Amino acid sequence: NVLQQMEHGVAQHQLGDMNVRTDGLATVSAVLNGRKRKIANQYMMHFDLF
Amino acid sequence: LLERGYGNTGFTDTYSAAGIRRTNGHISLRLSALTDDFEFTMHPLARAEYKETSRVSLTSMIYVGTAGKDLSLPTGTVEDIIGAVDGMRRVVRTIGGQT
Amino acid sequence: SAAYNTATAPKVPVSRATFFQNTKSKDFDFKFADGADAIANVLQQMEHGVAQHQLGDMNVRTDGLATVSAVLNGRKRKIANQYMMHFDLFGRAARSTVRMESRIQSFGEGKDVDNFMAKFHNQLSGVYERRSEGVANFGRILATDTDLGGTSGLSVVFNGLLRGLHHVSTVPTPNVANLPIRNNRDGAGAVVGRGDMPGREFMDSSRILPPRSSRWYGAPGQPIVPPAPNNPPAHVAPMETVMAGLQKTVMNELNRVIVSIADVPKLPAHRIRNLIAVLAAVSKPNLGFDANRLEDHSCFTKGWLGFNDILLFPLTVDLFDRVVANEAGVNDAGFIVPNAAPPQFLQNTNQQVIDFRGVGVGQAGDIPALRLAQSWSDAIGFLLDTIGGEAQLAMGLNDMVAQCFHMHGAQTTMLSTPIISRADFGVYHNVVTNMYRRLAYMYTRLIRTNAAAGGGAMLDRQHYQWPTHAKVGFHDDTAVNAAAAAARIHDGLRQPLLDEAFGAGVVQPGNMDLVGAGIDFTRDLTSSLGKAYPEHRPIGADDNKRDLGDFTAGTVDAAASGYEWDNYVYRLFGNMSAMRSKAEFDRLLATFPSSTLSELFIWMGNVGFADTWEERWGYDAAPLCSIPIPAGHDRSMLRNWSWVNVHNVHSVTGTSENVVLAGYVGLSRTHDYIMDTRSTPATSQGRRLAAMFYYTNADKMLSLTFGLAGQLRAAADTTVAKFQICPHTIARAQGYIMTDNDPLSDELKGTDFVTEQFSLAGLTNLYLGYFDGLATRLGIYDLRYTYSEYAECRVELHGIQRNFLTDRLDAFVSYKCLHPIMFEYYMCGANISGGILNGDKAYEQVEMGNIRAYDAMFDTSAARDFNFVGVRGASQQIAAVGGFHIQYKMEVEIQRPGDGTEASRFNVYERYLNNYLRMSDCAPTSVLNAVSPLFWMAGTTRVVLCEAANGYKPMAYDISQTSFWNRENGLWAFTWGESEKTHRPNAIPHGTRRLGNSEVLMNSRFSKILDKKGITKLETRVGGRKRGDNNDDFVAADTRMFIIQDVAGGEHAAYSSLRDPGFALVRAAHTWDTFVQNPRMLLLERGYGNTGFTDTYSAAGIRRTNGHISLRLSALTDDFEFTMHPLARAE
Amino acid sequence: FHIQYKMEVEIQRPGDGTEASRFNVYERYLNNYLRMSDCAPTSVLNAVSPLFWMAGTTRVVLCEAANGYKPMAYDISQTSFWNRENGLWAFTWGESEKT
Amino acid sequence: SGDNGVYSGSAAYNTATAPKVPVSRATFFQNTKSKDFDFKFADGADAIA
Amino acid sequence: GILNGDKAYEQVEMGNIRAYDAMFDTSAARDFNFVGVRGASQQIAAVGG
Amino acid sequence: HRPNAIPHGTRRLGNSEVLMNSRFSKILDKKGITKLETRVGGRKRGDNND
Amino acid sequence: RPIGADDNKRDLGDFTAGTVDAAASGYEWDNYVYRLFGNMSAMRSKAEFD
């Protein structure tokens, strides 16, 4: 499974993000894209590096 | 910031059902600006596996109006356009031997 | 059914052919070439022996607004008629992006990495040093990782190589001023020494094609590294160092894109160095180009996000020695290479790095190899003959054309939309209000005249060159003493005019003594606005009164000064009654051609002028009279419609796009080479396609793609008409209620108008499915339907982001772009709506008793090609020939389902049904091309067209009399001429061909109508009083001017100021509806002067308008047919 | 309060190509409020609606007017007659514990 | 509810899908007729009956 | 999660019902809950402020 | 554009390139984003006097 | 962020103010908090400030 999962990750292009080089608040982002009205939103999860 | 409240309007604290109806525009209109057909096209740790599930198009242009005729094209208009395109005999069928 | 009907007689059955001309030749059948392969199709169209669009039918190389033309030849009276088709080259409305991902995956579950690493570093030992950490690192990547979906992402690379080819070819000249290259600006926008972007250089042959360590400094046989003052640049590293830096990035992608070349095509070495400059720049965002129009990006350059930098990886030494090969300096027979130039080497490299940079605008660099359209087509052939991408160039063409080609929509070019919906709201949102203020100001100032040698002393007479406004003026121009009570215009309309414009009396009528000497009209006929005036073109006492005359009133030789522009706009709107209110003024401006609105925006904004209008006219009030046009927008950009609404600019496909498809990395091609060097990736069909791109010019490629843009836009026009795609239909799919009538939306609020059984998910699959079915039948093979299915590619329709407030009244205008005749051009005579009227039938002489509407005489139930809105549109064009308007009421009976409220009728689409027709900008020459708005109505509503009460009324002005004077700018007013000696100035702005004898034969036929019904007369008569020289007395001035007419053509002295009978009406208490005009102005208004005529119905009116419709239409018509052809393929 | 209704007579002219004519009938009673009947001058329940006395052989379409809910002129509940021998009639009062 | 020409649409709970109340005459109007007894009209043979 | 715009559930009106959530019947749904409607209706109200 | 930032993401998805709620703030006037207005708000002390 | 005379009143100004360029000093921080809770009716008591 790890071999399969190593082909992916949170960081893609204009779809996901990773801010881990921080002073203690690493986040992982993801853009939710709307088809009917072209409304987009961004969601985060915050990790405690302390 | 800006505190919000009732001002020079006969509004009071009410119940949820009567207060949602009372604030009609500030909910129905905003929901149209805020909501959408939101969808996730990506997943970390997994790959999109496509499925053939009969993608749906709308069967008919639902016309409204109780009196009059609609603005649809005359029934022999697109038929004459297809016949003209067929005359040019350019229909593409293969891409490097592959259909 | 609760409605009482009235008995009536059967009506005359009519079909489309009764009213509209079939523009298909029955004598000349153009034949077509077979073929069902798409790669073969590219080869057939690219043969030098065929042409899709002739070079005289393409104004492609313009700063915006590329037009492509066609000619309709009448085969009976031999008169022609030119039709255009406008494309955009601005990036304001592109909305499509393309990106390529270099994602690599793992492969070969068991393949022993260490034994491939042995093959790699032994096979490549003759080029790269075998025992190095770069050959071991890059042989470690090839042994473990392959690329995900390679050689199918060559569509994107060929997409961007064609984008750059068109970018450098649709520009007026490939200069450094027209084609900037992005430099590296610091703070305050200064370059950083070479202007080359730091991490990824593309002005040097070192990031792409790094040197060889065997040829670098310090290698055995090569010189030692030079000292500090001339050391090699820091960013140049040998290839084996670059391979040591390849790695898999965070996005599972490779660091670079490896394009490994085994053997090289035998191009002249100077052409290898040029296409390498191109290959380095295609990776960068926007192709490495800068913003070259309106401080924005081009139509082709915008939306190119780029990919990782290509790495030219020579598997042999024949590309390393091909770049540095020198072929110039030899002029022997059998040895000379044409255009060959010596290599340009980056200094302090061991003659191993080629330098592409040249001088630029300031301190910025400029790669001259990027401004050559040959180097972008050379790079396409180079990649095909080295990498097999033949099947992906055919996809690259069709994807580039759909993404990078945009039309202008009916609102700009055919329909009479106001500036609110025609122009950009972020800039031109107060241009009608401020232009009304300017005119209201100038019309109420007494423009005094300088006294006799009295410094600062003025006379109350208004100056001669500024004719007095008939309604809100001060006095009679042709008066001995302007102080006489008899020669004083009633001041009943003056103050309310300024209150309407400014408000509550903040501006009052006064004096302007700033131009009392006179206007300096220019002799520069290119930039002259004074050439249009009848009074500036006098004729002799014996000369024909129809003569155009000679422009004999220029004074200076500079360009048109500011005051000359003020005079033209002063006289243009002087006689127009649409100054009673701002609401009526905006309706006037709605009927002006877009090519004239561009000249009003130059004036409204002071684009090129030395001094502003306020400085010229001494305006000192609080409200503003000008608008802030952006910095980038020039006079030449405004004339190319940089002011249009970015929502009226429709892509050729009716869809947008955002494609992200994983692409070429080159690990699969280089791995297969090390396994077996005796194969090729390029097939013999890809080597043939590669050969043609070597042997091609921009002209041949431009017509190939500007023909596809026409073909796809005609297939989208068919799909738009089929599915009624309009802003109302798209908004209904998004869940809104868009309707030009606000009370119609309040009544539709709670009903089942908006359903889940009508959404964008289905409306897009209908559009894409039906469009990509036509596109195949036309042999185009577009991938809109394919890319719609992909997870990361989004395909959406056109109006997903429209402004509901501004474009509300445009809700029912369908998205068809091209003229009803340009559809017949492309679709072999087929048509959707209806174009040119007919002369073969007497549909205007049919008369029936007690039928009140004209189009109620005709019965279209049995017609298969004709509709109830096709006769209403035909009648609107029939009446417009005579200069008349038929007001149609359109109505939606909305009864809420299940609600007991009264069934209500709502007048819909009253922006266009209430305003007069407009000379379309596609074909501005003949009236027959003025197309009715009823043909661009769509929507999901059932309407009831019916004649309005007394709907037959005269137009504001006769559009058959207005004509453009020249191709360069939009000088437009009433035109005359067309005598035995001269010709009428009727020109097509942005036209492609010069108007021939068959274009001036149309003007000649139209000017020789019975009773001079085809012309506007001119007469020479006193029309002012020039101040006598060396005194303060005004001697009468003899002026050539127009003659004001009626509906019926009568010419009475009471219709005119400058005549005693006609000025008597103005001196009394008059209104804005009085029929008194100043003939010294460039637009004349129509009316029922001294005739018994009133507003009748269409049927009775068309009978009353006997000669002006029947005779005019006979002179404007032949049996037109298309003897040209846009669809040419070789066998 | 008062609910305003409309009876609409529509005349079609499709063979003339001009707009149809819509006419209002019975407007004398649909535009004027209900009345305390003389048959029973005691309760509001006895005030009869004019729609029940609509007759005729013509084809009308009955539908409620837009924003037709408006208060009456005076509240007919409060009016009553003082005498059986004449027509004294005004706002009345007095139903107390003793009167 | 305009808000700049932005009219939303009731997608599933509109006037077409509204639950109407089944109504009879007796729902609105009073039946002034006793169920305890009936009034039999005088139906004889001749008018004097 | 987030709300929807597919339906006009904010336009549903009923007589004598005081609570907004009491307008809806979740009993047939095996998917949804009673705190789901109340939690949704708090997000519906928060849209309007 | 409206300043709709993501207070801990990167110079990426929403903070740089995508627009979040591009439609609520855009197409709505009386029931959308609050309005701004230029009028006399305060008094600035005149220079060289009181 | 002042605006023009005939600009779109629902615009975003260009931030004409600002005199120093070093860093937001203490007084500028105080002003931001001064205006943030300026017209909050939750300052009546500490409980509703919580």
Author numbering:
A (entry chain A): 51 to 100
B (entry chain A): 1093 to 1191
C (entry chain B): 11 to 1141
D (entry chain A): 894 to 992
E (entry chain A): 2 to 50
F (entry chain A): 845 to 893
G (entry chain A): 993 to 1042
H (entry chain A): 547 to 596
Text taken from the publication that reported this structure:
Rosellinia necatrix megabirnavirus 1-W779 (RnMBV1) is a non-enveloped icosahedral double-stranded (ds)RNA virus that infects the ascomycete fungus Rosellinia necatrix, a causative agent that induces a lethal plant disease white root rot. RnMBV1 is a potential viro-control approach agent for restraining and controlling the white root rot disease, because the virus can confer hypovirulence to its host fungus. RnMBV1 is an approximately 52 nm bipartite dsRNA mycovirus composed of dsRNA-1 (8.9 kbp in length, AB512282) and dsRNA-2 (7.2 kbp in length, AB512283). The RnMBV1 capsid is composed of 120 chemically identical MCP subunits and additional surface CrPs.
The 3D reconstructions of the full and empty RnMBV1 particles were performed with 12,230 full or 14,602 empty particles, and were then generated with the icosahedral (I) input symmetry. Finally, both maps were generated at an overall resolution of 3.2 Å using the “gold-standard” Fourier shell correlation (FSC) = 0.143 criterion. Each MCP_A proximally surrounds the 5-fold axis, while MCP_B is located distally from the 5-fold and otherwise encompasses the 3-fold capsid intermediates. The amino acid residues Ser2–Lys1193 were modeled for MCP_A, while Ser11–Val1236 were assigned for MCP_B in accordance with the reconstructed full-particle cryo-EM map. In each MCP_B of the RnMBV1 capsid, there is an extra-long 111-amino-acid-residue (Leu1126–Val1236) C-terminal arm/loop, which goes across, interacts, and interlocks with three adjacent subunits in the order of MCP_B1 to A2, A1, B0, whereas that of MCP_A (Leu1126–Lys1193) interacts with only one adjacent subunit. Each full protrusion domain in the RnMBV1 MCP is composed of two fragments of the amino acid residues Ala433–Leu648 and Met965–Ala1125, which form 7 β-strands (Sp-A-G) and 13 α-helices (Hp-A-M). The protrusion domains of MCP_A subunits form dimers on the capsid surface (green rectangle in Fig 3C), while those of MCP_B subunits cluster to build a trimer around each 3-fold axis (yellow triangle in Fig 3C). Hence, for Megabirnaviridae viruses, the pores are also expected to exist; however, the 5-fold pore is obstructed in the RnMBV1 capsid. Positively charged residues Arg140 and Arg141 conformationally block the pore and contribute to positive surface charges.
